[PDB]
Write a protein that holds these residues in place. Structure first.
Motif, PDB file in Angstrom:
ATOM      1  N   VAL A   1       0.844  -1.188   0.000  1.00  0.00           N
ATOM      2  CA  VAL A   1       0.000   0.000   0.000  1.00  0.00           C
ATOM      3  C   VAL A   1       0.880   1.237   0.000  1.00  0.00           C
ATOM      4  CG1 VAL A   1      -1.904  -1.170   1.148  1.00  0.00           C
ATOM      5  CG2 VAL A   1      -0.278   0.135   2.521  1.00  0.00           C
ATOM      6  N   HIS A   2       0.432   2.256  -0.719  1.00  0.00           N
ATOM      7  CA  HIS A   2       1.017   3.586  -0.691  1.00  0.00           C
ATOM      8  C   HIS A   2      -0.029   4.538  -0.138  1.00  0.00           C
ATOM      9  CE1 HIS A   2       4.654   2.809  -3.258  1.00  0.00           C
ATOM     10  NE2 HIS A   2       3.924   1.739  -3.521  1.00  0.00           N
ATOM     11  N   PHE A   3       0.417   5.535   0.623  1.00  0.00           N
ATOM     12  CA  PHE A   3      -0.507   6.427   1.311  1.00  0.00           C
ATOM     13  C   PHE A   3      -0.692   7.727   0.535  1.00  0.00           C
ATOM     14  CE2 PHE A   3       1.348   3.554   4.301  1.00  0.00           C
ATOM     15  CZ  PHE A   3       0.409   3.284   5.275  1.00  0.00           C
ATOM     16  N   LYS A   4      -1.960   8.123   0.384  1.00  0.00           N
ATOM     17  CA  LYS A   4      -2.354   9.444  -0.094  1.00  0.00           C
ATOM     18  C   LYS A   4      -2.209  10.465   1.017  1.00  0.00           C
ATOM     19  CE  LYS A   4      -6.336  11.708  -2.350  1.00  0.00           C
ATOM     20  NZ  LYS A   4      -7.612  11.445  -3.078  1.00  0.00           N
ATOM     21  N   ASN A   5      -2.635  10.074   2.208  1.00  0.00           N
ATOM     22  CA  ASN A   5      -2.531  10.853   3.429  1.00  0.00           C
ATOM     23  C   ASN A   5      -2.623   9.864   4.583  1.00  0.00           C
ATOM     24  OD1 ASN A   5      -5.422  10.579   4.280  1.00  0.00           O
ATOM     25  ND2 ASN A   5      -5.787  11.814   2.443  1.00  0.00           N
ATOM     26  N   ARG A   6      -2.712  10.390   5.805  1.00  0.00           N
ATOM     27  CA  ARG A   6      -2.718   9.557   7.005  1.00  0.00           C
ATOM     28  C   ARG A   6      -3.799   8.488   6.963  1.00  0.00           C
ATOM     29  NH1 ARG A   6      -3.492  11.871  13.240  1.00  0.00           N
ATOM     30  NH2 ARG A   6      -3.848   9.813  14.183  1.00  0.00           N
ATOM     31  N   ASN A   7      -4.906   8.783   6.294  1.00  0.00           N
ATOM     32  CA  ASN A   7      -6.158   8.072   6.443  1.00  0.00           C
ATOM     33  C   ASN A   7      -6.553   7.282   5.204  1.00  0.00           C
ATOM     34  OD1 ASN A   7      -6.458  10.044   8.863  1.00  0.00           O
ATOM     35  ND2 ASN A   7      -6.452  11.395   7.076  1.00  0.00           N
ATOM     36  N   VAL A   8      -5.951   7.581   4.054  1.00  0.00           N
ATOM     37  CA  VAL A   8      -6.361   7.038   2.765  1.00  0.00           C
ATOM     38  C   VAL A   8      -5.131   6.590   1.981  1.00  0.00           C
ATOM     39  CG1 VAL A   8      -7.775   7.438   0.715  1.00  0.00           C
ATOM     40  CG2 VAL A   8      -8.242   8.732   2.794  1.00  0.00           C
ATOM     41  N   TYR A   9      -5.233   5.429   1.338  1.00  0.00           N
ATOM     42  CA  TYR A   9      -4.202   4.982   0.409  1.00  0.00           C
ATOM     43  C   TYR A   9      -4.209   5.833  -0.847  1.00  0.00           C
ATOM     44  CZ  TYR A   9      -5.491   1.436   3.594  1.00  0.00           C
ATOM     45  OH  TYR A   9      -5.828   0.780   4.752  1.00  0.00           O
ATOM     46  N   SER A  10      -3.019   6.160  -1.342  1.00  0.00           N
ATOM     47  CA  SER A  10      -2.922   6.551  -2.738  1.00  0.00           C
ATOM     48  C   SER A  10      -3.079   5.330  -3.617  1.00  0.00           C
ATOM     49  CB  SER A  10      -1.588   7.243  -3.012  1.00  0.00           C
ATOM     50  OG  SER A  10      -0.508   6.449  -2.563  1.00  0.00           O
ATOM     51  N   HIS A  11      -2.649   4.173  -3.114  1.00  0.00           N
ATOM     52  CA  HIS A  11      -2.790   2.960  -3.904  1.00  0.00           C
ATOM     53  C   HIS A  11      -2.760   1.728  -3.007  1.00  0.00           C
ATOM     54  CE1 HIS A  11      -2.613   0.663  -7.643  1.00  0.00           C
ATOM     55  NE2 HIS A  11      -1.860  -0.165  -6.941  1.00  0.00           N
ATOM     56  N   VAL A  12      -3.871   0.998  -2.957  1.00  0.00           N
ATOM     57  CA  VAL A  12      -3.832  -0.405  -2.554  1.00  0.00           C
ATOM     58  C   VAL A  12      -3.427  -1.254  -3.744  1.00  0.00           C
ATOM     59  CG1 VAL A  12      -5.138  -2.400  -1.765  1.00  0.00           C
ATOM     60  CG2 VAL A  12      -5.600  -0.145  -0.803  1.00  0.00           C
ATOM     61  N   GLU A  13      -2.419  -2.100  -3.534  1.00  0.00           N
ATOM     62  CA  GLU A  13      -2.068  -3.235  -4.367  1.00  0.00           C
ATOM     63  C   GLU A  13      -2.084  -4.480  -3.484  1.00  0.00           C
ATOM     64  OE1 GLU A  13      -1.804  -4.674  -7.751  1.00  0.00           O
ATOM     65  OE2 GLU A  13      -0.991  -2.632  -7.800  1.00  0.00           O
ATOM     66  N   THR A  14      -2.674  -5.574  -3.958  1.00  0.00           N
ATOM     67  CA  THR A  14      -2.779  -6.759  -3.109  1.00  0.00           C
ATOM     68  C   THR A  14      -2.882  -8.002  -3.972  1.00  0.00           C
ATOM     69  OG1 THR A  14      -3.649  -5.701  -1.139  1.00  0.00           O
ATOM     70  CG2 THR A  14      -4.346  -7.961  -1.527  1.00  0.00           C
TER      71      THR A  14
END
Lengths: 49, 63
Positions: B1-14
């Motif tokens: 996962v990469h974060f957009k901000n504290r609360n939201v991913y910029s990108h889930v990869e799984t």
């Protein structure tokens, strides 16, 4: 699944607000007849009598 | 996962492997896991497994 992905907070936008029917009492005096539809066809015979 | 901000991913990869044991007792993948979200409030794949399945090992914790 639709709940989870958006998270919970969004759902307020679709759980639509509905109007409670508050009462409406009225002092409905009798409906005045239409001059043209109701009164006039009788007026020719009853006016001034 | 990469974060957009504290609360939201910029990108889930799984990603990974879903596996079956054959009558031979051999094992294979029969499905790949291939999920992306970008942003999300979670990860439906993992969220699903915790709600529908179990770890292969667990601690027998003493009382």
């Amino acid at each position: 699944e639709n709940k989870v992905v958006n998270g919970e907070a969004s759902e307020a936008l679709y759980k639509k607000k509905i109007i409670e029917r508050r009462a409406n009492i009225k002092f409905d005096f009798p409906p005045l007849p239409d001059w043209k539809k109701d009164i006039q066809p009788l007026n020719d015979k009853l006016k001034g009598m | 996962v990469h974060f957009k901000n504290r609360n939201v991913y910029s990108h889930v990869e799984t990603r990974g492997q879903v596996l079956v044991e054959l009558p031979t007792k051999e094992i294979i993948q029969v499905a790949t896991v291939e999920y992306v979200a970008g942003e999300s409030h979670g990860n439906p794949v993992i969220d699903y497994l915790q709600r529908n399945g179990q770890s292969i090992e667990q601690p027998v914790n003493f009382e």
